[PDB]
Design a protein around this ligand. Structure first.
Ligand SMILES: CCCCCCCCCCCCCCCCCC(=O)OC[C@H](COP(=O)([O-])OCC(O)COP(=O)([O-])OC[C@@H](COC(=O)CCCCCCCCCCCCCCCCC)OC(=O)CCCCCCCCCCCCCCCCC)OC(=O)CCCCCCCCCCCCCCCCC
Ligand SMILES: CCCCCCCCCCCCCCCCC[C@@H](O)O[C@H](CO[C@H](O)CCCCCCCCCCCCCCC)COP(=O)(O)OCC[N+](C)(C)C
Ligand SMILES: CCCCCCCC/C=C\CCCCCCCC(=O)OC[C@H](COP(=O)(O)OCCN)OC(=O)CCCCCCC/C=C\CCCCCCCC
Ligand SMILES: CCCCCCCC/C=C\CCCCCCCC(=O)O[C@H](COC(=O)CCCCCCC/C=C/CCCCCCCC)COP(=O)(O)OCCN
Ligand SMILES: CCCCCCCCCCCC(=O)SCCNC(=O)CCNC(=O)[C@H](O)C(C)(C)COP(=O)(O)O
Lengths: 220, 62, 178, 459, 128, 124, 175, 67, 88, 52, 111
């Protein structure tokens, strides 16, 4: 299970960083996160895997709805090469996708942190396959890589869409659904983490560089 | 007609299910099984009035 | 799609189609507009360099290495318009396209709604019925004895004729039928 | 048991003395009433069977089959009256008479206490089916189909007859109760091997076993709709039922005489499922799917376990219902366009939405979606086979995959895509066709609520 | 100049890389003209029935009829017992049967002689 | 870590085996070893239903943490001192395991030195 | 309730702790429980009281059928069809009752595993042992009988097992 | 809220979407800063990692190589 | 909702808008009926680029066999109107 | 090549695993002998742990 | 009786009511998507309560309500596990489904 999860997460993250359809990138992200769930099953941490399921649901669903709002605004266009500068044109969508990408990459004290941070620490501090651990760390870096790709190509720079601009995100249904899952992606990690009994022995003692490894590989 | 949705889609279904569980499902053994509650030192048992003693005087490494 | 294909493509047509494909794949490679404009001007210059070549053997071999270079350097994931054959919305609305003859099978209660629409539909059916034989006669007259050579069709030529074989072109369902 | 037989016999003078425009109504109403009456045989005992008399008895194996037969007659009548409209009054009455005689023979076959009576009715079912296929089939191949349907059966059943009389010379009786109570082991001898083969090969041909199955695609494709419905839903099961009765005298010989048939069934199940992937004729695909399901039933009967017998009973009933529904679904489109080529009429979900829903539900039951009784039977058989040998899962699982692959394939080919442009005579679905589909599908779903009623004696 | 693309069965040669489309002779042009003429005659034959107001039903396609007939009924009359067909039939029809027979018989012989020795761990195995 | 480099690239015979340790007697180098004591009885852990992997020498702190969480249920931010105490006890247990690892590797290196050097002085 | 026998389906005395609040914050579980009581349990209880009042006015009984003990297959002659028939019916009933005995023991095991939580491996040892004993006896009685099992086949299986045990004991007395 | 296309111009924006986007970005940043001010150890670890080399032989039970 | 229904005037205005931003075309003598070859003095490469610019303008691409023979702005407007089911 | 390389490297990583420089985790009551299946009638071999 | 079991089963049961109404008049109206979304939101709100009960006392349950069939010694019953995983995942899934249905009311408006 550990080896299958490791090869899955790294292969899918490697495929994600060159894709041009936004839905395809987010789907490969989902596959990579499922691979991470499988590796945390393989190191005998089932409760941590379930916690990751619950955490990842929020921000992955929010990321898909942000992609859907972009697609609907740009007349059903899904290629990031034809999405220009939407940072100012779609401000709420930009905010939501930024927060979702930060949660996906394990930014501290967000929903993805309380899950992903622990999984990386547990893999680092276990009697585990060395290749699997290396592949997991590389996949962790590739996650930030393809999140950067989405943000940079879809929201930064100059417009690359057809001249008839139909951009409109001022619908209460879209705004309210995104807002609800955004509050989820911000606070559900803390709430659920502090409101459940401890099902695991915590890793309280580890070298400092190993403590900071997930953030370091994300920064890279 | 303001809250007609919550009385026909919530209150009525929970009336039928609670009646079904309380008087039919639990009329047979082992149909609804709960894990026993956790008991900690110092607790008082409601059923018999028994008191569990405390836990062996920690070394108190403060 | 609307034009009848010919037996073969001329050298000029092949060269133009290669130009269009190369420019589109270059745009796929060069995401940004200014960079694409620069490299598209370079492509146009490199393409014009041999515009006035006379030896057709040399032009043909130049076209061959141009095709080889395109195949080696094409974008593996080129941009496709959403409703183009490889696009994400290619045949999306085909399930909503219903042929017009289905309207003949509606219950009389269904046709009681929309009376004016069905009056105009009867008018259209009368037109088609009255024009069919003249269309067939015109097609028989204008076709060489050795059968048709291409798929091109003639227009109407008399005062009150309709172009032959027009019904199914004119009564297309729609591009966004629902 | 005569309370079922005599009304069925009375169906004959009723249809022969009815008004020219009343034959279908009378036959349908009274066959439905007979099915309602037969529904009372489902009250079974456990310990032993319902022994009405010296001649007829009912078991937990016989009763679901009897109910399925009596229920299938009205559906066949409903499906037949469309394409038989132009027929004369006398020939319509003769067609209904063939159907009634077939039901009578099947009802007596499923309840006969004595093996020679069972054999005689088992052969008697041949004649009405042959007449139906060769007189009311549409194409010129029907005649050849009839021959294939006949001599495959007889070439298997003639040895069985010999074995049967031989048995009565040594045992003294062919009454099934006596046979079961006084059963003795078969020794390991050449004479016993050939008596085993004579006792088994007729039911093998009827299943049909892979390699003896060539008659089935011909006969089911060339037959009219009621013929195909009865051939797939009930007649094939005549093999299975027969095996479940006769294996009680074949132990412990079956312990090793069953290896070639098990290998044939598993491999040919894979083979026929794969054949379904490349089939241009829509009825042929359904026929080959029937062959694959019956191969699984053969495996279940040959391994001789309570779980396998239960699974075989459930799968027989479920497949009868599902295959009859699929044949009716294909016949609706055939009557639309007068061709059985699967790719001729496409995108039919756009033009016939409710019939598309019927197609979808039939395809779901064909691939054994839980908790349908199709999967109940299939899973029981697979678990018993796994106990027989753990490697069987490799083949069984493979079959499952291929089954889904062709089922949805059929669904995708006829219902999805775009409609064929030049086909402009696709009229809305009639109430008769929708009602026929519903009367196929609803009992199948209701059987999920009470599965034991089809799980057989071993429950 | 650039690495060469070589075709395969499941990844065919593109038209633009096909030399046959660049070495053109008058007979090639006349053959293309004949192909276009055949296509056009068939197209006119189809469109005269497709647009007919009085046509109701299915336009029967002889090509589809020929395809289904060749795939089903024309096969046995054109079959000839050949060493190639004989070996292929023997292999693909009989080899899997003995292969699976050997596999299952070996597995069951192991399991049975292991039951005889009293070492199989059959505890809690009461359903079968 | 560097221990993996020493075991895999250097001489593995001088490095501890995580699967097979300790090999030296627990009282070998120590004159007097006090046996590790447990506070929580078997019944207390069974009634708390902790987990079979949470029933270590730190279980009493976990029991108080669970009781405090249950007692102040609405206020999920109140069990900080108990969580800290349990974490500290687990940290001390981990430090003890690190001490055992270091002790066993030092013992094994000292064993190799003494054995092969008494051989060296015994071969001449 | 008293509908079932507590000896056949036992359960431990069900100790539950008393609530020991440690905070001044209101407990939402208790408030929601009171709301649920008042809006769900009281109307359901009243409806059940009405239904039981109606049932009391119409009280009738049904009985459990008792079967005599008939001779078993051991003392039936070789070709006596009637004694064989009655012995076979009795054997079928005994087989059904044994199946339901195994079912009761399995129900005990499942309920124990759920009830004990994280301590099921140690606290359900008695149920596991009871299921092991019952399962072994059932496997000895009825396994490998096949599709067409009968009292005669069970008798033959028992005789084969008895012969094996006798030979084992005889050769153990020689060692 | 009726918004019209603009043909090669920046689209018309509403005040509500801008204020909500800014509010939620600020909420995320404040939450991160607040949690780091109160729960810094969750990133930085709370207990010091020991150095095994700073442990004497007496407390680990190693004899001075002559026994 | 979605984009407003397209009109013939809008299609013509956008086609002329794109053509007037092309440097090889005089903005003031350009008409809806101007032949690209005879009147404007362009070549086939310029026609290919004009077709591509129109495809970018309207977010859909024209097949080469159809695109080869759009030799004036009115022809492009008519082609777009027929493709997108515009009648007014 | 990618798949074969991944399989070979996973096998190598199995041969040369990663772990932390710690001893085994210790459990109080004879390594929880009664908790892990019991059998309380056979006097299990005492597992004793000492301070370090 | 304990409200835990009744609430856990009701949360699941009320999700099936619009499937029963799919043949009613509301299905032919434009109010059906809003009705489905409201049903899912009410189900999420109801499922929030067993989660609170579990977070308070760690309550877990199994409910074997309907006996389907008995296969000699194997009893098959409709049984639901209401442990930590179920009572934690159900509200999360319902919350996500509620947001996604509200989003679909706008995304698929012209379908
Ligand atoms: C699970 C939900 C529970 C809901 C509770 C209430 C359910 C009532 C359903 C009653 C049975 C349905 C009747 C079958 C024929 C359909 C009649 C029809 O023509 O519809 C037209 C009718 C009118 O619509 P229209 O606009 O006029 O035009 C319709 C068009 O044709 C176009 O129509 P369409 O495109 O919209 O499709 C119509 C619909 C209808 O077509 C179908 O395919 C539905 C049939 C289901 C599949 C059947 C074969 C697969 C094997 C499963 C066997 C299940 C049997 C269980 C017992 C059944 C008792 C009869 O198809 C679908 O919507 C998609 C089907 C996918 C469902 C997959 C189910 C997998 C398993 C689910 C759980 C099963 C066990 C539950 C318990 C498990 C443990 C708790 O449309 C409907 O009303 C929709 C039907 C309702 C959907 C049912 C889906 C789930 C129900 C399955 C069985 C119910 C079990 C109840 C036990 C308690 C739970
Ligand atoms: C298209 C599909 C049609 C249906 C197929 C039906 C399959 C039926 C096959 C029957 C399976 C087994 C039959 C008999 C069992 C054993 C057969 C024999 O091969 O085994 C050996 C038998 O020894 C020799 O091999 C003798 C048999 C060889 C002669 C028979 C010719 C076989 C050639 C294949 C002919 C094709 C048959 C099918 C025609 C269509 C075992 O040796 P031994 O244990 O000492 O003797 C056992 C018999 N005793 C106890 C009575 C003494
Ligand atoms: C509609 C609204 C009804 C309002 C009034 C009813 C209020 C309560 C009615 C109580 C009725 C009494 C009652 O049900 O008692 C139990 C009674 C009989 O006991 P059995 O368990 O069946 O005995 C074994 C026989 N197999 O059971 C029942 O009849 C009710 C069963 C309904 C179950 C709930 C729905 C689940 C079934 C869906 C079908 C799924 C297909 C098979 C699933 C396989 C699962 C492994
Ligand atoms: C769709 C095609 C199906 C073809 C089926 C053909 C196989 C049928 C099985 C054999 C048929 C005849 C068997 C006779 C019935 C058995 C009754 C019996 O027990 O008689 C045997 C006698 O058995 C025989 O004589 C049978 C020998 C075979 C005679 C005919 C040969 C035909 C070809 C043989 C092989 C084909 C059979 C299997 C084919 C499988 C299906 C393809 C013993 O009687 P006694 O003489 O008293 O001896 C007692 C002391 N030992
Ligand atoms: C970016 C990814 C892949 C890119 C790689 C592509 C490589 C291509 C490099 C350069 C291509 C060439 O040299 S192309 C070499 C082709 N040679 C000739 O065409 C000579 C004869 N000229 C004519 O036929 C006409 O002038 C015509 C030019 C058709 C215009 O005609 P109009 O005026 O009537 O439109």
């Amino acid at each position: 299970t550990l080896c299958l999860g490791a090869i899955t997460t790294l292969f899918t993250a490697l495929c994600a960083i060159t894709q041009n359809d936004i839905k395809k990138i987010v789907a490969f992200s989902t596959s990579s996160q499922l691979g991470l769930m499988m590796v945390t099953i393989g190191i005998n941490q089932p409760h941590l895997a379930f916690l990751h399921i619950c955490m990842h649901a929020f921000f992955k669903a929010m990321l898909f709805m942000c992609s859907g709002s972009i697609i609907h605004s740009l007349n059903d266009e899904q290629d990031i090469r034809k999405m220009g500068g939407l940072y100012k044109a779609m401000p709420f969508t930009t905010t939501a996708l930024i927060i979702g990408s930060l949660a996906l990459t394990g930014m501290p004290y967000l929903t993805g942190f309380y899950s992903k941070d622990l999984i990386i620490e547990a893999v680092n501090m276990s009697y585990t396959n060395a290749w699997a651990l290396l592949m997991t760390l590389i996949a962790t870096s590739l996650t930030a890589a393809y999140s950067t790709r989405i943000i940079f190509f879809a929201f930064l720079g100059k417009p690359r869409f057809p001249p008839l601009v139909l951009i409109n995100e001022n619908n209460p249904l879209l705004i309210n659904s995104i807002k609800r899952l955004l509050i989820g992606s911000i606070f559900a990690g803390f709430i659920i983490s502090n409101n459940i009994p401890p099902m695991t022995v915590p890793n309280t003692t580890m070298p400092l560089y190993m403590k900071m490894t997930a953030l370091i590989v994300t920064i890279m | 007609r303001h809250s007609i949705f919550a009385v026909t889609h919530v209150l009525i279904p929970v009336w039928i299910i609670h009646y079904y569980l309380k008087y039919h499902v639990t009329a047979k053994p082992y149909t609804v099984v709960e894990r026993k509650p956790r008991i900690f030192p110092g607790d008082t048992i409601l059923e018999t009035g028994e008191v569990i003693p405390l836990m062996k005087e920690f070394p108190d490494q403060h | 799609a609307f034009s009848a294909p010919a037996a073969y493509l001329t050298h000029q047509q092949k060269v133009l189609r290669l130009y269009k494909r190369a420019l589109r794949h270059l745009e796929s490679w060069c995401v940004h507009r200014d960079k694409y404009r620069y490299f598209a001007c370079l492509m146009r210059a490199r393409f014009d360099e041999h515009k006035n070549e006379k030896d057709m053997v040399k032009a043909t071999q130049l076209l061959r290495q141009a095709e080889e270079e395109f195949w080696y350097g094409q974008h593996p994931q080129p941009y496709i318009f959403p409703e183009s054959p490889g696009g994400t919305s290619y045949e999306r609305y085909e399930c909503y396209k219903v042929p017009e003859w289905c309207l003949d099978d509606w219950h009389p209660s269904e046709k009681a709604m929309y009376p004016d629409y069905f009056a105009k539909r009867e008018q259209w059916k009368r037109l088609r019925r009255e024009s069919w034989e003249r269309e067939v006669k015109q097609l028989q007259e204008e076709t060489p004895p050795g059968g048709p050579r291409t798929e091109a069709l003639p227009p109407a030529r008399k005062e009150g004729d309709l172009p032959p074989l027009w019904w199914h072109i004119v009564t297309r369902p729609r591009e966004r039928p629902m | 048991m005569l309370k079922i037989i005599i009304p069925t016999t009375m169906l004959l003078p009723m249809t022969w003395m009815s008004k020219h425009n009343m034959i279908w109504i009378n036959a349908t109403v009274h066959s439905l009433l007979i099915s309602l009456i037969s529904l009372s045989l489902l009250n079974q005992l456990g310990e032993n069977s319902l022994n009405f008399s010296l001649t007829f008895f009912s078991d937990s194996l016989s009763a679901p089959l009897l109910v399925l037969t009596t229920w299938l007659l009205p559906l066949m009548l409903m499906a037949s009256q469309s394409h038989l409209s132009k027929e004369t009054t006398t020939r319509k009455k003769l067609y209904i008479t063939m159907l009634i005689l077939l039901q009578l023979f099947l009802i007596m076959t499923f309840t006969a206490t004595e093996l020679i009576l069972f054999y005689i009715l088992f052969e008697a079912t041949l004649v009405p089916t042959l007449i139906i296929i060769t007189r009311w089939g549409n194409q010129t191949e029907r005649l050849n189909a009839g021959l294939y349907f006949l001599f495959y059966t007889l070439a298997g059943s003639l040895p069985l007859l010999v074995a049967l009389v031989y048995i009565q010379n040594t045992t003294g009786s062919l009454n099934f109760l006596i046979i079961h109570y006084w059963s003795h082991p078969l020794s390991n001898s050449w004479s016993n091997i050939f008596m085993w083969l004579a006792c088994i090969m007729a039911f093998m041909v009827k299943m049909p076993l892979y390699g003896l199955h060539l008659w089935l695609p011909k006969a089911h494709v060339e037959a009219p709709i009621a013929g195909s419905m009865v051939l797939a839903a009930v007649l094939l099961k005549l093999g299975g039922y027969g095996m479940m009765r006769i294996t009680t005298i074949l132990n412990p010989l079956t312990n090793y005489m069953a290896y070639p048939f098990l290998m044939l069934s598993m491999w040919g199940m894979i083979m026929t499922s794969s054949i379904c992937l490349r089939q241009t004729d829509l009825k042929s695909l359904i026929a080959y799917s029937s062959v694959s399901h019956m191969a699984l039933v053969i495996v279940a009967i040959m391994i001789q376990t309570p779980w396998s017998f239960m699974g075989a009973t459930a799968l027989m009933i479920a497949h009868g219902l599902t295959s009859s529904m699929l044949f009716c679904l294909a016949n609706t489109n055939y009557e639309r366009v007068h061709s059985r080529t699967m790719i001729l009429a496409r995108g039919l979900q756009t033009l016939l939405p409710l019939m598309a829903t019927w197609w979808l539900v039939a395809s779901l039951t064909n691939l054994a979606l839980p908790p349908s009784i199709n999967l109940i039977g299939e899973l029981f058989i697979i678990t018993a086979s796994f106990s027989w040998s753990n490697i069987t899962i490799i083949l069984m699982g493979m079959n499952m995959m291929i089954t889904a692959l062709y089922s949805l394939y059929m669904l995708i080919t006829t219902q999805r895509g775009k409609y064929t442009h030049h086909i402009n005579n696709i009229k809305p679905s009639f109430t008769r066709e929708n009602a026929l589909m519903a009367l196929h599908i609803l009992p199948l779903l209701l059987l999920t609520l009470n599965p034991k009623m089809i799980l057989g004696p071993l429950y | 100049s650039f690495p060469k693309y070589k075709p395969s069965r499941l990844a065919t040669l593109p038209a633009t890389l096909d030399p046959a489309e660049y070495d053109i002779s008058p007979e090639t042009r006349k053959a293309q003209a004949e192909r276009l003429a055949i296509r056009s005659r068939l197209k006119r034959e189809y469109l005269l029935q497709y647009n007919d107001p009085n046509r109701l039903g299915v336009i029967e396609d002889p090509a589809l009829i020929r395809w289904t007939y060749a795939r089903s009924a024309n096969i046995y009359p054109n079959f000839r017992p050949t060493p190639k067909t004989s070996l292929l039939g023997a292999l693909f029809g009989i080899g899997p049967l003995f292969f699976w027979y050997y596999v299952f018989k070996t597995d069951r012989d192991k399991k049975e002689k292991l039951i005889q020795e009293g070492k199989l761990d059959q505890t809690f195995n009461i359903s079968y | 870590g560097a221990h993996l480099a020493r075991r895999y690239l250097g001489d593995a015979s001088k490095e501890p085996d995580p699967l097979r340790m300790p090999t030296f007697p627990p009282d070998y180098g120590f004159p007097e070893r006090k046996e590790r004591e447990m506070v929580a009885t078997q019944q207390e852990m069974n009634d708390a239903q902790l987990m079979l992997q949470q029933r270590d020498y730190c279980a009493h702190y976990l029991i108080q943490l669970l009781k405090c969480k249950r007692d102040s249920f609405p206020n999920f931010l109140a069990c900080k001192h108990e969580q800290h105490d349990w974490d500290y006890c687990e940290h001390l247990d981990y430090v003890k395991r690190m001490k055992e690892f270091e002790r066993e590797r030092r013992l094994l290196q000292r064993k190799k030195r003494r054995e092969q050097r008494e051989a060296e002085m015994a071969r001449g | 309730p008293d509908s079932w026998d507590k000896d056949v389906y036992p359960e431990p005395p069900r100790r539950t702790p008393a609530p020991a609040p440690q905070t001044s914050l209101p407990n939402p579980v208790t408030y929601l429980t009171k709301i649920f009581d008042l809006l769900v349990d009281r109307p359901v209880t009243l409806a059940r009281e009405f239904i039981e009042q109606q049932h009391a006015k119409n009280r009738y009984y049904y009985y459990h059928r008792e079967f005599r003990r008939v001779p078993d297959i051991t003392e039936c002659e070789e070709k006596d069809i009637l004694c064989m028939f009655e012995a076979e019916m009795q054997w079928r009933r005994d087989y059904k009752v044994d199946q339901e005995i195994v079912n009761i023991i399995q129900e005990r095991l499942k309920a124990c595993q759920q009830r004990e939580g994280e301590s099921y491996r140690q606290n359900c040892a008695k149920e596991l042992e009871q299921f092991t004993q019952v399962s072994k006896a059932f496997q000895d009685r009825y396994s490998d009988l096949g599709a067409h099992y009968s009292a005669r086949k069970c008798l033959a299986k028992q005789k084969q097992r008895m012969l094996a045990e006798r030979k084992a004991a005889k050769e153990a007395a020689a060692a | 809220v009726h918004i019209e296309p603009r043909y090669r111009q920046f689209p018309q924006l509403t005040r509500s979407q801008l204020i909500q986007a800014e509010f939620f970005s600020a909420t995320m940043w404040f939450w991160i800063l607040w949690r780091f001010w109160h729960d810094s150890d969750a990133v930085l670890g709370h207990f010091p990692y020991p150095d095994p080399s700073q442990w004497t032989d007496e407390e680990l039970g190693i004899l001075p190589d002559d026994e | 909702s979605d984009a407003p229904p397209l009109t013939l005037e809008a299609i013509k205005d956008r086609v002329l808008y794109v053509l007037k931003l092309y440097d090889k075309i005089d903005p003031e003598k350009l008409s809806v009926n101007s032949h690209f070859m005879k009147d404007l003095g362009l070549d086939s490469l310029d026609q290919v680029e004009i077709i591509m610019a129109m495809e970018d303008e309207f977010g859909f691409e024209i097949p080469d066999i159809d695109a080869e023979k759009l030799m004036c702005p009115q022809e492009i407007v008519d082609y777009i109107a027929d493709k997108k089911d515009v009648y007014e | 090549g990618f798949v074969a390389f991944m399989l070979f490297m996973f096998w190598v990583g199995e041969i040369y695993p990663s772990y932390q420089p710690v001893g085994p985790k210790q459990y109080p009551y004879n390594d929880l002998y009664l908790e892990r299946g019991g059998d309380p009638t056979k006097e299990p071999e005492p597992v004793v742990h000492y301070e370090i | 009786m304990n409200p835990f079991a009744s609430l856990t089963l009701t949360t699941l049961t009320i999700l099936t009511i619009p499937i029963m109404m799919s043949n009613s008049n509301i299905y032919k109206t434009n109010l059906y998507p809003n009705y489905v979304k409201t049903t899912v939101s009410y189900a999420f709100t109801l499922s929030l309560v067993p989660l609170l009960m579990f977070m308070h006392t760690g309550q877990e349950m199994i409910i074997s309500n309907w006996h389907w069939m008995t296969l000699q010694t194997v009893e098959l019953s409709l049984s639901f596990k209401m442990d930590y995983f179920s009572v934690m995942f159900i509200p999360v899934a319902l919350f996500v489904t509620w947001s996604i249905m509200e989003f679909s009311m706008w995304y698929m408006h012209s379908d």
